[PDB]
Motif scaffolding. Sequence first.
Motif: not given
Lengths: 625, 625, 322, 300
Positions: A224, A226-227, A231, A233, A239, A267-268, A270-271, A274-275
């Motif tokens: 992952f 980092t943005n 968080f 990403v 993706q 958070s992982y 959560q991402y 989100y996707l």
Amino acid sequence: RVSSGRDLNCVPEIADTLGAVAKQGFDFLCMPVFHPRFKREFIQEPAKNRPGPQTRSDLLLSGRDWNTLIVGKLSPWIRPDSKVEKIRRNSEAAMLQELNFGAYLGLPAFLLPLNQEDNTNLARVLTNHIHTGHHSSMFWMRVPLVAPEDLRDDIIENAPTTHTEEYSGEEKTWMWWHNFRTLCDYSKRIAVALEIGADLPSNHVIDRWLGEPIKAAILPTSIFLTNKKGFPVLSKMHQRLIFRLLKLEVQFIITGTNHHSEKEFCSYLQYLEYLSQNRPPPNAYELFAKGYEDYLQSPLQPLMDNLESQTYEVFEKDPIKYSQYQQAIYKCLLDRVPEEEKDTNVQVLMVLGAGRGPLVNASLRAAKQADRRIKLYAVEKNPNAVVTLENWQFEEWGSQVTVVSSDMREWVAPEKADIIVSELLGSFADNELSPECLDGAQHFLKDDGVSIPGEYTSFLAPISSSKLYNEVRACREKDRDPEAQFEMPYVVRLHNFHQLSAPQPCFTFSHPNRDPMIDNNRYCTLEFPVEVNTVLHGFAGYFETVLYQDITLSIRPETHSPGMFSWFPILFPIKQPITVREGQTICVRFWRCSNSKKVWYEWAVTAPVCSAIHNPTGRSYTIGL
Amino acid sequence: RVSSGRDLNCVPEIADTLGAVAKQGFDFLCMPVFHPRFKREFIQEPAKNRPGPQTRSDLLLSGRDWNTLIVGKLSPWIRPDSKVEKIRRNSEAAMLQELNFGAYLGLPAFLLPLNQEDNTNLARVLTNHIHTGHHSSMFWMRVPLVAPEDLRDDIIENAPTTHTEEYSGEEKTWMWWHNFRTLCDYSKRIAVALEIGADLPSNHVIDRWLGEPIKAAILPTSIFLTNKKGFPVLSKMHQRLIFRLLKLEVQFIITGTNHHSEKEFCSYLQYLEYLSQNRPPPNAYELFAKGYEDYLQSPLQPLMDNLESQTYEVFEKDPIKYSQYQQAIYKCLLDRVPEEEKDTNVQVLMVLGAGRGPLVNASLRAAKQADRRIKLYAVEKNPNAVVTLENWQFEEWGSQVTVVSSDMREWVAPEKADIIVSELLGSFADNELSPECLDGAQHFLKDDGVSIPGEYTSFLAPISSSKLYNEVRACREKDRDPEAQFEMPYVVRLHNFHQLSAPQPCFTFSHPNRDPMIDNNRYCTLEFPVEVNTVLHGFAGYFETVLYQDITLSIRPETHSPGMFSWFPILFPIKQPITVREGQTICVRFWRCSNSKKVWYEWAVTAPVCSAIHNPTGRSYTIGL
Amino acid sequence: MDNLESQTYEVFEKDPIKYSQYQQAIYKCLLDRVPEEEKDTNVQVLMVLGAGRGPLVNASLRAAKQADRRIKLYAVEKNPNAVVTLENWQFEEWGSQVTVVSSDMREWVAPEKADIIVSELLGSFADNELSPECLDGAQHFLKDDGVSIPGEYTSFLAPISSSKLYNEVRACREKDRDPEAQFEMPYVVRLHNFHQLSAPQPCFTFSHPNRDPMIDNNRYCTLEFPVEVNTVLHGFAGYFETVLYQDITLSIRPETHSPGMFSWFPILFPIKQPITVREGQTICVRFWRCSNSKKVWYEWAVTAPVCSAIHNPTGRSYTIGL
Amino acid sequence: CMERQLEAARYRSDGALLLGASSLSGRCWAGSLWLFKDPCAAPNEGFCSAGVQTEAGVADLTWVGERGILVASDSGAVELWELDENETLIVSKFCKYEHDDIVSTVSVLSSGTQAVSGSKDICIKVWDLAQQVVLSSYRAHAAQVTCVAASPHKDSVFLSCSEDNRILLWDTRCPKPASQIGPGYLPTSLAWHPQQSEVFVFGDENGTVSLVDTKSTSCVLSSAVHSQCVTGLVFSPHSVPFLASLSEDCSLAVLDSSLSELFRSQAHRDFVRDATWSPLNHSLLTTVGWDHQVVHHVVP
Ligand SMILES: Cn1nccc1COc1ccc2c(c1)CCN(C[C@@H](O)CNC(=O)c1ccnc(NC3CCC3)c1)C2
Ligand SMILES: Cn1nccc1COc1ccc2c(c1)CCN(C[C@@H](O)CNC(=O)c1ccnc(NC3CCC3)c1)C2
Ligand SMILES: Cn1nccc1COc1ccc2c(c1)CCN(C[C@@H](O)CNC(=O)c1ccnc(NC3CCC3)c1)C2
Ligand SMILES: CSC[C@H]1O[C@@H](n2cnc3c(N)ncnc32)[C@H](O)[C@@H]1O
Ligand SMILES: CSC[C@H]1O[C@@H](n2cnc3c(N)ncnc32)[C@H](O)[C@@H]1O
Ligand SMILES: CSC[C@H]1O[C@@H](n2cnc3c(N)ncnc32)[C@H](O)[C@@H]1O
């Protein structure tokens, strides 16, 4: 929603750990049933008689929690394919022990790794466990996209990494899987947990996997990025792969420690959610087809049997198909009679196979649209649908429509038709005997008459799918040939498969057949260039049809009619899978055979290796005339 | 709740009628799909070519309404077994037509009458329809308790009713059913709609039916009495029959017109719901067993296989069984050591087969209850359960309990036991190899030692059940003997069956076996007096066990332990049903056979006719040692 | 599990090479176990574990008359029908010297320990008739310095090509069992219309007495066969060799076949699907000898050049009852 | 209580004994650290100088000076615990979760301010114990790292061995720090020679101990010492040291310079996990095992 789990190798308190990972939002927990560092001896003393308990107690969780929330992980020290005989025997005993404990707990799935080329004894032990006792646990083989040897840093001075590219070498992991599931004889309980690395492999390696039974995708925290806000990403290509996996409805497993230590661990996940929420929206076809993914459907009889009321009800609700039919009839009426004749000329239309009358109303609408006069016959061989037709003709249609309860091949028409309209096409176009029916009917078509559809053509494409191969294998029934299920085509919304070459036309039929020797028997040879290594399991079949001039229907993927759900693809399986290398050519041969009573397909693969001629003389599948 | 339908023979408007009967509260509607007076010709002209429509349109209802709310009724003029050949042919054609229309509509059930003795051609046509096409409609044969010829008024001067009693004559209707379903080869889609008359028949006629596949009970309005307030009610015997039918979960069909014309029509259904709410409350056993009714369960391996965690979890929650075990251990401790020795004497107890330790805690509680000292061994061959045992011994039990991971036949005991306790009994007592295990274990029992259970005995009773016979028939599997499913016992909560004679003891075992030639092989002959006409399909099996003196367990129905759910009855089927007349004797023979590797049962019926010797040499069912 | 018929003993009794080799082994062992100065003071305890109708009993008698040494004979046989023959011969001919024991060698409580134990429990694949299990159950009454004849044995495998035998195996499909169970069991067959693709290589080896505290007869072996032609693999032929005593040997391995010995035909492990092999490719096969308390069976799979399915897993199609 | 599976035993220069244990079975899978200034009284929990409980099991540890203790945890963490100034409490200093799997091996570099950790996540990491951060993270192996061992005198040199059958000599001064020292059986234990800074010894999973001179990639000598995996190798403090080998065959062996056996012990009934020589009596060797035994041997 995403079905997601947390992978862990350290669980001090199972209650505490499960509560924590559930508060984080995960749906299940992948953990070891024995302490991963707790090696056990089974042969020689004194370590043979180590006093127990050997692991934690099953009473720490309830039966439902064990059955729904826990995935077992094989201990990492268990190596059944070691080269030390002592280690081999101890690993065999310990693997049987841990698998039996997982079955005792009723675990829904158990994790075993494929991290080397030789897993023969592992497969032996797993197959013997599968054929021992009565348990229903799934077995997830953990296999990476890229082997760790091909991911290592180039920091070894006297052993550098080969920077030259190897096409099959970078595919080696798939072979690790392919051999394993081959040794286990394609057990339906053995699936893939695909582990994604930081650097994705080339596209072809990823292309191999998507026809395989992937039940889980494992995402380490180390992959992952980092943005700007901190968080975790993923890259754009990661993706894309995650989207493809979401279409396959796999479960996503998050492993490793928390590397974004400013944020929490949820958070992982959560991402990932989100996707999932921001995935491409499904089209109308994908909505209509949701639920039929890879569901096999046996061949039906369009003439021996009669269609049920619900079938007409559901296949009546296809607006694209019937709007295309209406446009075809409208253009034909306009091109068959000029405006100065719009009142003097009545056109004889015959709906050969009217059902409940959707094409009858389509013809009525096309006549009201072209401002031309029509005389309608509605011929239907299904008497149950003739009831519907006659009730509609009494209540609505009237003198204009004449309902004819007969087979079109049997009906002695009182007059000849200017236009005949039919919808007798199956998934392979002619597999529902449209040529025979329209040949039996074309004798009352005017010498200048028009048939809608004007013509149709079938298409074939070699596919790769262990999923659908296993689904066909599971269709073996008592009191018939143990391999008859491989000698018949299935209608199926293909999904977990890999199209190996572009679809090419197979059989073509035109109406009216302007040949004195009308012969619907066919023999065709198709050559498919293959530009990947793969395993062939069958041939997908589609069709296109010209209703009138530029008015067309198609289930061919490249030219698929938008939002048309009426036809799913067809599948011609083969008894034995065929290995195909990069650059090789799949040569297949298809026969359309018939006698006075029935019609059937015969097919055989002749390159790169020969298969047996499938369904000879229609011994396993025929279409009654 | 009651699943109830309304029978009608006059439906002017299907929408209006369905709305009305649904507002009345019914769940489905039994109606004709063609007008019952609309006779149709199929052979000779001019009536052959009668212009349609032949019936009402399928578009008047939705597919879901057709599939869930409509039961079809065969037209009354259709008589396939008429003696006029023209009527026979027309009725064959019309019956095929109406059945095909019912399949077209997707009707869940279709009603056909059995109102005479000869229904051979009706069965021929129905069987051919069942073996034609792909449909899933049930077929309810409407058959009365008493034939209309035996219900007619005695108002014919020169043809009086025979006031003399005929035992088999008043059963004739059952024969009408029995032959019919026999001609159709026990099709699972052919069930009974039993029609109840004003005067019930004698008890034996009603006894015949309750083992048959009754899916509906038809209650004419003419059989309803009138109470003081004017509402329709039933007699007490009719209420008893309705209760028995409610236990069978049949659907209740109300037919005929409204004869209580001061009240509305929903009053009959209201009285049915009243009876359903005021039914006898179910006991604890009937609550624990709800869901297992007539569910067959194949033989398991108590020694070859290991029990799962959920199995221990559920069978641990039987308070009656373990309270009885605790009482047995308590009485034995009190009778084995006096009060003046309560501190000087420690008793060696060995739980041979401890599982997760319910009998261990039972022994602890019995010792705390008798104020005596015990030394506990917990022997268990299932290592997964040994994990639980050792965790409990570390956390709770301690020095007192010694966990022994071994087979009791293999364990070299360090000392001899005063008491050995086990729960190795199956549904047929010895079918889980308790004798062999306790024989292998009794060598470390003191010469004055006690075994709990002290003894056990199996019981057999001949039963009648087309339901369970069909359920066993449906267990045919590929890759084995096509009749192997009849040569193995099943555990099943018997429900839709008829016990034909009182249970009689079969095999008996005692522990310790004080015989020098310990032989667990058995041969037993049982004679069952039958006082009804019936059809034998198998033998139910129960057991009783003496744990200690007056402390007993039993699944025998007459002495069943209250609220004990641990054991369901067993079922020994037979390949072919055997007809038994009133007064005849069912003579059956059972063998308990064994070699060094396995144990199995063999059984054969020798009266009133001989069956084949079932499961010879254990070719279809064995219990691994 | 089963007992041999009388005609079977009758036909397999007429192998002079096998029994002459056994006689030579017993003779050399008697000479090497007791010197000439002891030829009268020392009687040797011989136990024929599996005597049948008594061909090895008479072989031991002849070997003793040949070595001029004294022997005490036990003839143990689990087949009672053959025990009838043995007891009639012991009453008519043998006499006090031979003691007939109607028992399984794994079950027999011996009254004394034997100097020599002699057996002929070898199948076509050596250990496929459970000679290791039987001799392990019997070796507890062998003297600490005791001798077992055969001393050791070894099985051999070789990949073969044969459409004939593949079709013959395919034609063995029977109703009421797995439609592919006929491919998961070994067959004894005088191989003829076939093509041996590589040299036979040793598979499993057993020695007696097993001088290991953890006697384990389960095995896992991997064999690599270089192939120098294009061909189609349909199965694996199986042979065996056995050391009866030192240089005294028997063999059905083709390169070292005992001349004129008809007692053993080769064995055949088929595979469900034929496997194409190119010139220069290597056939890699794997064989397991598995067992539980009740039965013993073989499992086998081809892993190169392509993988086959693991054949006969958990003995679902073929087991040898213990 | 003290978790049964005793994992590590280390003698301090002043004579005290450090014990690291883990609970590899039962309800709780945690670990603990203990310090006995009276080593003969171990493993009695009431006879110790200090003791503390960690969250997860201790897979390996090592002294960091006189009061520091570096712990490789099952949780994927490396944790530094500092001893009390009264030496009556063991308090955590840092606990960083940097590995994605069990940390199986740790070793303090010669400077005493940096460490090297190996894990089943296949990576090796260099730690600056002062800044409590990771200086470098290498992924040279292809399988789980079984052992890492810092060179006793060179601060940038250490050995690693993993299940990819690789033994790697590491000099972090080179752009490619790893160098392969040769395929037989997997290496499991590594022990530098205390005097010759270019000689080491390694044991394999098959019970063989071999002696390697890093100048020439060839086994100078080897011997089959155990019947099972050699889990550890510890040199004695003698002028000419003896080599102590522990294995999963539950036996302890003491060999000489030419790998000839001088002492053999079967006092343990489970896996022998660590051995440490007394700095006060060079003939005293303390071993620990999963049988919860702390044995004191008198080596001749
Ligand atoms: C004359 N008339 N009056 C009223 C109505 C009509 C038209 O009646 C029909 C009746 C049947 C068929 C057609 C028309 C044309 C299509 N044809 C397809 C078969 O050849 C192969 N099956 C499939 O492809 C298939 C299977 C299952 N589900 C599928 N789709 C799902 C997605 C939501 C529905 C597709 C069957
Ligand atoms: C030692 N230990 N530790 C913890 C717990 C234990 C006791 O463990 C067991 C485990 C299994 C069995 C027993 C005890 C005794 C009974 N025995 C019955 C079989 O012989 C035949 N099966 C049936 O009759 C049957 C099938 C399905 N459902 C049934 N009942 C439904 C109604 C709600 C449950 C009954 C199986
Ligand atoms: C104790 N006693 N007393 C009197 C006699 C005896 C020895 O009794 C026996 C009995 C059976 C066997 C033996 C000895 C040893 C050999 N063994 C071979 C099997 O393992 C496999 N079968 C084959 O190979 C086979 C099959 C069919 N025909 C074959 N050959 C043809 C050519 C003309 C005969 C070979 C069976
Ligand atoms: C929409 S599927 C094709 C329709 O035409 C009808 N049909 C198929 N074959 C024939 C035929 N030979 N003659 C008349 N109708 C037919 C079917 O019953 C169905 O309603
Ligand atoms: C409560 S079901 C009987 C229990 O005893 C155990 N058991 C059955 N047979 C034996 C045996 N021969 N030796 C030891 N335990 C046994 C089973 O595993 C189960 O826990
Ligand atoms: C010559 S084939 C082997 C001979 O030894 C006998 N045999 C095989 N196994 C045993 C055994 N376990 N104990 C005794 N005799 C045996 C067989 O019945 C046959 O006569």
